[PDB]
Write a protein that binds this ligand. Structure first.
Ligand SMILES: *[C@@H]1O[C@H](CO)[C@@H](O[C@@H]2O[C@H](CO)[C@@H](O)[C@H](O)[C@H]2NC(C)=O)[C@H](O)[C@H]1NC(C)=O
Ligand SMILES: *[C@@H]1O[C@H](CO)[C@@H](O[C@@H]2O[C@H](CO)[C@@H](O)[C@H](O)[C@H]2NC(C)=O)[C@H](O)[C@H]1NC(C)=O
Ligand SMILES: *[C@@H]1O[C@H](CO)[C@@H](O[C@@H]2O[C@H](CO)[C@@H](O)[C@H](O)[C@H]2NC(C)=O)[C@H](O)[C@H]1NC(C)=O
Ligand SMILES: *[C@@H]1O[C@H](CO)[C@@H](O[C@@H]2O[C@H](CO)[C@@H](O)[C@H](O)[C@H]2NC(C)=O)[C@H](O)[C@H]1NC(C)=O
Ligand SMILES: *[C@@H]1O[C@H](CO)[C@@H](O[C@@H]2O[C@H](CO)[C@@H](O)[C@H](O)[C@H]2NC(C)=O)[C@H](O)[C@H]1NC(C)=O
Ligand SMILES: *[C@@H]1O[C@H](CO)[C@@H](O)[C@H](O)[C@H]1NC(C)=O
Ligand SMILES: *[C@@H]1O[C@H](CO)[C@@H](O)[C@H](O)[C@H]1NC(C)=O
Ligand SMILES: *[C@@H]1O[C@H](CO)[C@@H](O)[C@H](O)[C@H]1NC(C)=O
Ligand SMILES: *[C@@H]1O[C@H](CO)[C@@H](O)[C@H](O)[C@H]1NC(C)=O
Ligand SMILES: *[C@@H]1O[C@H](CO)[C@@H](O)[C@H](O)[C@H]1NC(C)=O
Ligand SMILES: *[C@@H]1O[C@H](CO)[C@@H](O)[C@H](O)[C@H]1NC(C)=O
Ligand SMILES: *[C@@H]1O[C@H](CO)[C@@H](O)[C@H](O)[C@H]1NC(C)=O
Ligand SMILES: *[C@@H]1O[C@H](CO)[C@@H](O)[C@H](O)[C@H]1NC(C)=O
Ligand SMILES: *[C@@H]1O[C@H](CO)[C@@H](O)[C@H](O)[C@H]1NC(C)=O
Lengths: 231, 427, 392, 147, 49
C-alpha cells in the first residue's frame, strides 16, 4: 500500500559536462522520504493519474512488466500513447488505439488507427522517470543490481536519459500492462514528481554523487543557503 | 620612474575563422507553407513541425515581396549561421489593420481571443497582403468575437458554443443577451488598404539547448589546432585557442562549463572529438625599469608561466621583432613568481631595490646591466654566551633622529549641480 | 561567580607562593594579494565590448590603482612586524640556560624548514580546504599533468600574487629575535647585544615587578620546572584537535567568500537577453546588440566596484591589527612592560614570538601570586614620640 | 615622502574627477550644450539621463574614497597627539616609541600638513668583557647587590 | 555630545533611506501599483527596472 523512497529518483537535468562543482538546480523531482504506492497484481491493474510525472521502479524476475499506455479519454476521441517492447526492438505508437479495459500479451496487440509517427530502436533494479511537458516526452532510466529483501536501497543513483519524443498530448491517466498467458476480451512502485529545489554535487568524470533537497527540514535549508554539505 | 609596473594589453593579434556543422540531409519544406492556397483562419491555426533541414533564409527575405518582416530575438542577417533545435510554423489570413497585433504583449480581439504570442518570443513574423485569392465577397474566413476570459500564450481553442452575457440560460438555443461567436470577414476589391486580406506566417524556435537539427546553409572548414580563431560549433561561437582535450564526457553530453557559466570544452559535431577551449590575450605582464633618465633597458616578468612556454603563451610568432627579443634569449631566469627575461642572475645578496616577489629583487648595477638576486635579511652575528660572562659599556653617544607624521589634508567642496548639470535648467 | 572581599580597616592579605603562567595571543598581520584584469572580467576576449568600455572613461585604471595599493600595503605590513632588527643572531650550541628548556621554540635543523616544533603545529591548523577560488587557484600546481596550463588565463582575470618574504625568511627573522632575547636580554633592542647569563636576566625581570631578586635564586629550580611544564601544556593543547587559530581562519574565509561572489556574478544577465556575451553577438546586429551589451557592461562594472570598496575597508582593519602587532613586538619582546594586560594577564616577565600563516603568535610569561594569608597591619609605628614609616 | 604622498593622492583624485567629464557613457556626445541644440525634449531626455547616471556614479566613487582616506589621516593624527603628550611633555618608558635608544627628550617642529619630532636618545657604546657572579658568600651569608 | 552624535547620525541615515522611496528615478511614478495599471508588460517592465 505505502512505503518509503529514501533518496530515490535523481536524474540528470541537462547534457552539460560539469566537474568538481556544487550546482543548484530547480526542476520536477520526486521529494525525499515520500510515500510511494507499491503494487502487485494478485487477486491488480488500476488506472493512476499523471499529475506532473511518474517515478516508476519495479522488481523483475522473468520479463513480466513490459510497457505502459498513456491515455486521456480512452474512447477513441482523444489520442494516447503506447510504449511496448517484445525483445526485438522497443516500439512506440501514438495511434488512437482499440483500448479495451484490460490489455494482455499473446505469449501481438497492435492496431493501426490514424497514427502520427512511430519510433523503432529480486535481482536487478530498473527504474524510470516519465515527464511530459506538452512539446516533448522525456524518459530516464538506470540499471543497477539489488540484493535486498523487499525495498529500495539507500544508495545514490543518477538516471541518465534514453529518448525524447516530440509529442504534445495531454496525459491525465496512465496504465501499465504485465505478462499474461491468458487471452481475454473482458468487458511495481509509483510516485509523483513535484517542483523542488535540489543541490547536486559533481565530481570529476562528471557524476552526481549526492544531492541535497531544500524543503525537507530546517537543516536542509542551512545546507542549501550555505552551498555546503557541512555546517 | 624606477619600479615595476603591470601593463594592460596593447599587443596586436590577427585571427582567422572556423565553421563546423553536422551532416543534415535535405532542403527544407518552405515551398509548402508560403505557396499553399488552402490557408486557415485565426480561430483554428495549423502548427507544422520542422526538423532536419538545411534552410536558406536569405532567399526569402530578399527574393520575395513582403510587407513587414519583423524578427524578435534574432536578427535577419544572422539567421544563416545558427541552429534552431525545433522550428514551428503557423499560418492564417486576416485583415491588415490588425497585423500590428502579431507581436508580443499586444491587445485586441485577434490578440485576446485568437492568437497570443508569449512575451519572451523568439522568432520572426512575415506578412504580405492578398487581393486575389483571399477575396473575390469571400466568406471563407472566421474570427472569434466573444469569450469569457482571455487566452494564454500559444493556445488555441475551437468551441462553437453560444456566448451569454445577461440573465438568460442559453443552452443550444440563441436569444437575448446571447450571441454566436464565429462571424466572418467581408473581403472585396471594392475597397482600399486597411480592410484588404493579408497573409501572415509566424516562425518560432528555441536557441537554448539541444542537439541541433535545423541548421543554416553553411559549409564546414578545417581545425587549425592551437591558434586563436573565431570558432563556430553548432552555432555556439567564441574566440580563442583550441586545445586537444582528454576529458571524460558521457554519451549525451555536448560541452563543458566552469563555475561562471562559460564554455571551456566542446564536442566537434562531425569527428566526435572533445577539445579544450582557453582564452588568448595574456595580460599578465609586468615591466621592471630604472628611471627613464637613467637607461632604456627593461626586464619583463611573465606571471606564473614556466620559461619554455613563454613563446607559446604570449603568441610570440605574431608580434613585432622588438617584442620577440623578450620572449627568449640569453637572460632567462625562472622564479616562483614567473619567468624573468632580460636580467641576469648573480649569486651575491644585497638589500632589496625593486621587489619582484618570493624573495627575488632587481637592481641597476655594474657596461650597466640589470641584475637579479636573492635578497639578504642582514648581517650574520653571534653572541658570546656563557654562564658567567657579562658585557658592560664604557662610553656612550647622543643620538638625534627624525620622525614625520601627517596630521591634516586639504578641504575640498563640490557643488553637485554645477558638476553634473552645469549652468543648465533642463538638467 | 559571586565573591566578597573581607574588607576590614586593619586587615591585609599577602601571597606566600606563586605560579609561572604561559598564555597565547594571536594577531592577523597580512592578507591575500589579488589583482583583477578589468577588461578580461568585463568584456573577456571580445573586441566589440572593448570599444564600448572606452565610453565609460578610466574606471579600469582607477580600480587597478586601488588594488595595487592594497597589495603593496600587505608587504609593508609584514616588514613592520618582523624586520625589527638588522642583525641575524644565532644561539650557541651549549644550552646552559640555568635549567630552562627552550627546545620546542627554537629552530630544528633536521627538517627542511627553519621552523620550530610549535611553528610546525601552527602551520597545520589553518586550512584552505573549504575556500573555493583560492584553493583551486592553488591547484594550478599539477606539476606535469597538463603541459600548457597558463593558470592566469583560466579564472576570468582574477589572480593571486605571491608575498615578497617567503615563509623561511619570516622563520629566520623570528629565529634571530628569539636568539637575541635569550642570549642578551633587552640590550639588543637599544644598541649592540651585550651578553648576560639567563638567571641574572630573570633576576632583573623579577626586580621589574616588585619582587626582590633573592626570591628567584632561592626558588630557581621550581621556577624552571614550572616554566618547562607550561610550555608543555601549550604544545599538548595545540597538538590536539581543539582548533585555536580562529582569528586567522576568519580572514581567509572572508577573502574566499568575497572572491566566490565575484566569480558567481558572471552569470547574472542584469536585464539582457543572456548572460553569455557570445550569444548576444551571434544573434543580433551591432546597433541592437549595443543595447544588451551596455546592460551587461553596467552590471559587471557595479560588481567589480563593490568588490574593491569592501576590500579597501577590510585592508584598513588588517592595517590597524598589524600596527598593534608591531607595538607588541617592540614593547613585549624587546623590553619589559608595565602597562596592565598589554602583554598577558599578571605581572609581565618576558615574551617570545612565533610565526603563523599571515600572522604572529606571542607567548607571554607572567607572574601570578598564589596562596594568600591574613595578617593585621598598621600604617606607621610609634617608638620615641616619632612616627616611623617603612621604606619599601 | 610621507607628507608628499598625501598631496599627490589628493591631486590625482581631483584630476581623475575632472577628466571623467569628457566621457559620454553611451550618449551621442559628452557635451550637454550639444544635445540641447540638436534635439527636442522628448528625445534629448534619454541622452541627458545617461549622462546624469554616469556623472552621479563618478561623484559617488570620489566621495567614498575620500571618506576612506580621511579615516586613515584621523588615525595618524591620533598617534601624533599621543606622541606630543608622551614624548615632548614627559619621558617615555615604552620601547621604540620615541626613537631608537633610551629616550631622553623630544622637540617638535612644524611641517606642511604634518609634524616632525626630533628624539634625543642615549645609545651605549664601547663594551668590555668581565666575569660575573649572582651573589657573594662572606660569613656563611649570601650577599646580593642593591642596584 | 559624543554619545548623542552617534544616535543622531544613525537616525538621519535611516530617515534618508526611507525617504528615498518617493523618488521615481526617471520612471513615470514611484508606486509599483500605478505602473502596472497604466502600461502593458512589454514596456511596463522597463519602468520597474
Ligand atoms: C487534456 O485533457 C483533459 C482531460 O480530457 C482536458 O480537460 C477536460 O476536457 C473536457 C473535454 O471533454 C472538458 O469537458 C473538461 O471540462 C476539462 N476539464 C477541466 C477544464 O477541468 C483538457 O482540457 C485537455 N487539454 C487540452 C489542451 O486540450
Ligand atoms: C667616548 O667617546 C668620545 C667620542 O664620542 C671620545 O671623545 C673623543 O676622544 C678623542 C681622543 O682624544 C678626541 O680626539 C676627540 O676629539 C673626542 N671627541 C669629542 C667629541 O670630544 C671620548 O674620549 C670617549 N671616552 C672614553 C673614555 O673612551
Ligand atoms: C609552592 O607551590 C609549589 C607547587 O607549584 C609547591 O611544590 C610542591 O611541593 C609538594 C611537596 O613539597 C610536592 O608534592 C609537589 O609535587 C610540588 N609541586 C611542584 C610543581 O613541584 C611548593 O611546595 C609551594 N611552596 C610552599 C612554600 O608551600
Ligand atoms: C627539553 O624538552 C624536550 C621536550 O620534552 C626534551 O626532549 C625529549 O626528551 C624525551 C625524554 O628525555 C625524549 O624521549 C624525546 O625524544 C625528546 N625529544 C622530543 C620530544 O622531540 C629534552 O630532552 C629537554 N631538554 C633537556 C636538557 O632536558
Ligand atoms: C581573612 O579573615 C576573614 C575574616 O574571618 C575571612 O573571611 C571569612 O572567613 C570565614 C572563615 O574563617 C569564612 O567562612 C567566610 O566565608 C569568610 N568571608 C566572609 C566575608 O566572612 C577570610 O577568609 C580570611 N582569609 C583567608 C585567606 O582565610
Ligand atoms: C506517509 O506514511 C506514513 C506512515 O508510514 C505517515 O506517518 C505519513 O504521515 C505519510 N505522509 C507523509 C510522509 O507525507
Ligand atoms: C483520423 O482523424 C480523423 C479526423 O478527425 C477522424 O475522423 C478519424 O476517426 C481518425 N481515425 C482513427 C481514429 O482511426
Ligand atoms: C573517474 O574515472 C577514473 C578513470 O576511469 C576512475 O578511476 C575513478 O574511479 C572515477 N571516479 C569515481 C568517483 O568513480
Ligand atoms: C510560391 O511563392 C514564391 C514566393 O515565395 C513564388 O516565387 C512562386 O512563384 C510561388 N508559386 C506559385 C505556384 O504561386
Ligand atoms: C559528415 O560527412 C563527412 C564527410 O565530409 C564525414 O567525414 C563525417 O564523418 C560525417 N559525419 C557524420 C555522418 O556524423
Ligand atoms: C635622474 O634625475 C635625478 C634627479 O636630479 C638625478 O639625481 C639622477 O642622477 C638622474 N639619473 C641619472 C642616471 O643621472
Ligand atoms: C618547465 O618545463 C620543463 C619542461 O617540461 C620542466 O622540465 C620544468 O620542470 C618546468 N619548470 C618547473 C619550475 O617545473
Ligand atoms: C652562480 O653560482 C652557480 C653555482 O654556484 C654558477 O654555476 C654560476 O655560474 C654563478 N653565476 C654567477 C653570475 O656568479
Ligand atoms: C668577549 O669574549 C668573546 C669570547 O672570545 C669574544 O668573542 C668577544 O669579542 C669579547 N668581547 C670584547 C668586547 O672583547
Amino acid at each position: 500500500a505505502y512505503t518509503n523512497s529514501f533518496t530515490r529518483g535523481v536524474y540528470y537535468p541537462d547534457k552539460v559536462f560539469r566537474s568538481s562543482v556544487l550546482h543548484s538546480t530547480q526542476d520536477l523531482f520526486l521529494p525525499f522520504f515520500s510515500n510511494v504506492t507499491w503494487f502487485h497484481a494478485i487477486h491488480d491493474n488500476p488506472v493512476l493519474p499523471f499529475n506532473d510525472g511518474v517515478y516508476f521502479a519495479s522488481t523483475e524476475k522473468s520479463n513480466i512488466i513490459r510497457g505502459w499506455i498513456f491515455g486521456t479519454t480512452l474512447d477513441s476521441k482523444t489520442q494516447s500513447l503506447l510504449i511496448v517492447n517484445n525483445a526485438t526492438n522497443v516500439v512506440i505508437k501514438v495511434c488512437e488505439f482499440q483500448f479495451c479495459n484490460d490489455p494482455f500479451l499473446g505469449v501481438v496487440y497492435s492496431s493501426a488507427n490514424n497514427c502520427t509517427f512511430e519510433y523503432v530502436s529480486f535481482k536487478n533494479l530498473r527504474e524510470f522517470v516519465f515527464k511530459n511537458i506538452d512539446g516533448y516526452f522525456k524518459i530516464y532510466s538506470k540499471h543497477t543490481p539489488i540484493n535486498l529483501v523487499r525495498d529500495l536501497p539507500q544508495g545514490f543513483s543518477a538516471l541518465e536519459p534514453l529518448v525524447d519524443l516530440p509529442i504534445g498530448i495531454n496525459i491525465t491517466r496512465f496504465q501499465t500492462l504485465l505478462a499474461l498467458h491468458r487471452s481475454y476480451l473482458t468487458p511495481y512502485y509509483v510516485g509523483y514528481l513535484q517542483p523542488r529545489t535540489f543541490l547536486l554535487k559533481y565530481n570529476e568524470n562528471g557524476t552526481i554523487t549526492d544531492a541535497v533537497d531544500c524543503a525537507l527540514d530546517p537543516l536542509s535549508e542551512t545546507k542549501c543557503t550555505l552551498k555546503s554539505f557541512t555546517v | 620612474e624606477k619600479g615595476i609596473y603591470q601593463t594592460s594589453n596593447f599587443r596586436v593579434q590577427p585571427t582567422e575563422s572556423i565553421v563546423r556543422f553536422p551532416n543534415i540531409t535535405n532542403l527544407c519544406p518552405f515551398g509548402e507553407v508560403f505557396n499553399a492556397t488552402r490557408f486557415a483562419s485565426v480561430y483554428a491555426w495549423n502548427r507544422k513541425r520542422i526538423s532536419n533541414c538545411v534552410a536558406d533564409y536569405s532567399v526569402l527575405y530578399n527574393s520575395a515581396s513582403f510587407s513587414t518582416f519583423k524578427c524578435y530575438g534574432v536578427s535577419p542577417t544572422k539567421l544563416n549561421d545558427l541552429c534552431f533545435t525545433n522550428v514551428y510554423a503557423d499560418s492564417f489570413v486576416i485583415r491588415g489593420d490588425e497585423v500590428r497585433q502579431i507581436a508580443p504583449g499586444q491587445t485586441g480581439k485577434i490578440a485576446d481571443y485568437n492568437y497570443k504570442l508569449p512575451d519572451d518570443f523568439t522568432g520572426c513574423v512575415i506578412a504580405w497582403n492578398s487581393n486575389n485569392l483571399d477575396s473575390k465577397g469571400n466568406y471563407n474566413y472566421l474570427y472569434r468575437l466573444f469569450r469569457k476570459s482571455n487566452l494564454k500564450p500559444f493556445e488555441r481553442d475551437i468551441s462553437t458554443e453560444i456566448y451569454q452575457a445577461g440573465s438568460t440560460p442559453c443552452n443550444g438555443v440563441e436569444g437575448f443577451n446571447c450571441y454566436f461567436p464565429l462571424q466572418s470577414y467581408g473581403f472585396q476589391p471594392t475597397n482600399g488598404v486597411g480592410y484588404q486580406p493579408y497573409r501572415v506566417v509566424v516562425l518560432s524556435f528555441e536557441l537554448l539547448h539541444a542537439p541541433a537539427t535545423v541548421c543554416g546553409p553553411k559549409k564546414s572548414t578545417n581545425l587549425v589546432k592551437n591558434k586563436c580563431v573565431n570558432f563556430n560549433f553548432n552555432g555556439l561561437t567564441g574566440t580563442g585557442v583550441l586545445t586537444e582535450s582528454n576529458k571524460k564526457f558521457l554519451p549525451f553530453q555536448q560541452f563543458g562549463r566552469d563555475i561562471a557559466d562559460t564554455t571551456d570544452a566542446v564536442r566537434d559535431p562531425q569527428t566526435l572529438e572533445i577539445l579544450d577551449i582557453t582564452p588568448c590575450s595574456f595580460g599578465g605582464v609586468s615591466v621592471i625599469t630604472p628611471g627613464t633618465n637613467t637607461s632604456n633597458q627593461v626586464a619583463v616578468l611573465y606571471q606564473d608561466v614556466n620559461c619554455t612556454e613563454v613563446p607559446v603563451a604570449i603568441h610570440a610568432d605574431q608580434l613585432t621583432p622588438t617584442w620577440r627579443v623578450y620572449s627568449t634569449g640569453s637572460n632567462v631566469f625562472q622564479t616562483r613568481a614567473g619567468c624573468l627575461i632580460g636580467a641576469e642572475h648573480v649569486n651575491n645578496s644585497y638589500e632589496c631595490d625593486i621587489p619582484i616577489g618570493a624573495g627575488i629583487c632587481a637592481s641597476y648595477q655594474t657596461s650597466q646591466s640589470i641584475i637579479a638576486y636573492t635578497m639578504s635579511l642582514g648581517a650574520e652575528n653571534s653572541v658570546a654566551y656563557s654562564n658567567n660572562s657579562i658585557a658592560i659599556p664604557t662610553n656612550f653617544t647622543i643620538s638625534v633622529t627624525t620622525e614625520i607624521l601627517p596630521v591634516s589634508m586639504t578641504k575640498t567642496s563640490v557643488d553637485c549641480t554645477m558638476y553634473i548639470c552645469g549652468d543648465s535648467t533642463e538638467c | 561567580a559571586e565573591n566578597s572581599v573581607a574588607y576590614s580597616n586593619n586587615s591585609i592579605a599577602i601571597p606566600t607562593n606563586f605560579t609561572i603562567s604561559v598564555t597565547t595571543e594571536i594577531l592577523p598581520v597580512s592578507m591575500t594579494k589579488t589583482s583583477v584584469d578589468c577588461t578580461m572580467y568585463i568584456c573577456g576576449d571580445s573586441t566589440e565590448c572593448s570599444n564600448l568600455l572606452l565610453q565609460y572613461g578610466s574606471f579600469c585604471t582607477q580600480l587597478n590603482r586601488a588594488l595595487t595599493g592594497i597589495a603593496v600595503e600587505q608587504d609593508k605590513n609584514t616588514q613592520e612586524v618582523f624586520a625589527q632588527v638588522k642583525q641575524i643572531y644565532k644561539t650557541p650550541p651549549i644550552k646552559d640556560f640555568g635549567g630552562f628548556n627552550f627546545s620546542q621554540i627554537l629552530p630544528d635543523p633536521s627538517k627542511p624548514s627553519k621552523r620550530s616544533f610549535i611553528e610546525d603545529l601552527l602551520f597545520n591548523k589553518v586550512t584552505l580546504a573549504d575556500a573555493g577560488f583560492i584553493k583551486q587557484y592553488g591547484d594550478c600546481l599539477g606539476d606535469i599533468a597538463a603541459r600548457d596550463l597558463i593558470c592566469a588565463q583560466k579564472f576570468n582575470g582574477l589572480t593571486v600574487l605571491p608575498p615578497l618574504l617567503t615563509d623561511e625568511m619570516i622563520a629566520q627573522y623570528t629565529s634571530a629575535l628569539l636568539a637575541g632575547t635569550i642570549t642578551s636580554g633587552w640590550t639588543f633592542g637599544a644598541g649592540a647585544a651585550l651578553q648576560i647569563p639567563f638567571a641574572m636576566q630573570m633576576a632583573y625581570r623579577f626586580n621589574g615587578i616588585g619582587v626582590t631578586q633573592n626570591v628567584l635564586y632561592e626558588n630557581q629550580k621550581l621556577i624552571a620546572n614550572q616554566f618547562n611544564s607550561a610550555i608543555g601544556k601549550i604544545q599538548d593543547s595545540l597538538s590536539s584537535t581543539a582548533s585555536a587559530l580562529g582569528k586567522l581562519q576568519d580572514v581567509v574565509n572572508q577573502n574566499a567568500q568575497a572572491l566566490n561572489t565575484l566569480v558567481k556574478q558572471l552569470s547574472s544577465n542584469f536585464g539582457a537577453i543572456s548572460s553569455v556575451l557570445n550569444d548576444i553577438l551571434s544573434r543580433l546586429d551591432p546597433p541592437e546588440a549595443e543595447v544588451q551589451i551596455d546592460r551587461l557592461i553596467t552590471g559587471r562594472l557595479q560588481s567589480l566596484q563593490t568588490y574593491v570598496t569592501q576590500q579597501l575597508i577590510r585592508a584598513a582593519e588588517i592595517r590597524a591589527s598589524a600596527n598593534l602587532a608591531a607595538t607588541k613586538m617592540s614593547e613585549c619582546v624587546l623590553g619589559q612592560s608595565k602597562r596592565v594586560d598589554f602583554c598577558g594577564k599578571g605581572y609581565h616577565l618576558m615574551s617570545f614570538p612565533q610565526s603563523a600563516p599571515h600572522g604572529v603568535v606571542f607567548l607571554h610569561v607572567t607572574y601570578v601570586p598564589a596562596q594568600e594569608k591574613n595578617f593585621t597591619t598598621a600604617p606607621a609605628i610609634c617608638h620615641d614620640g616619632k612616627a616611623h614609616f617603612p621604606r619599601e
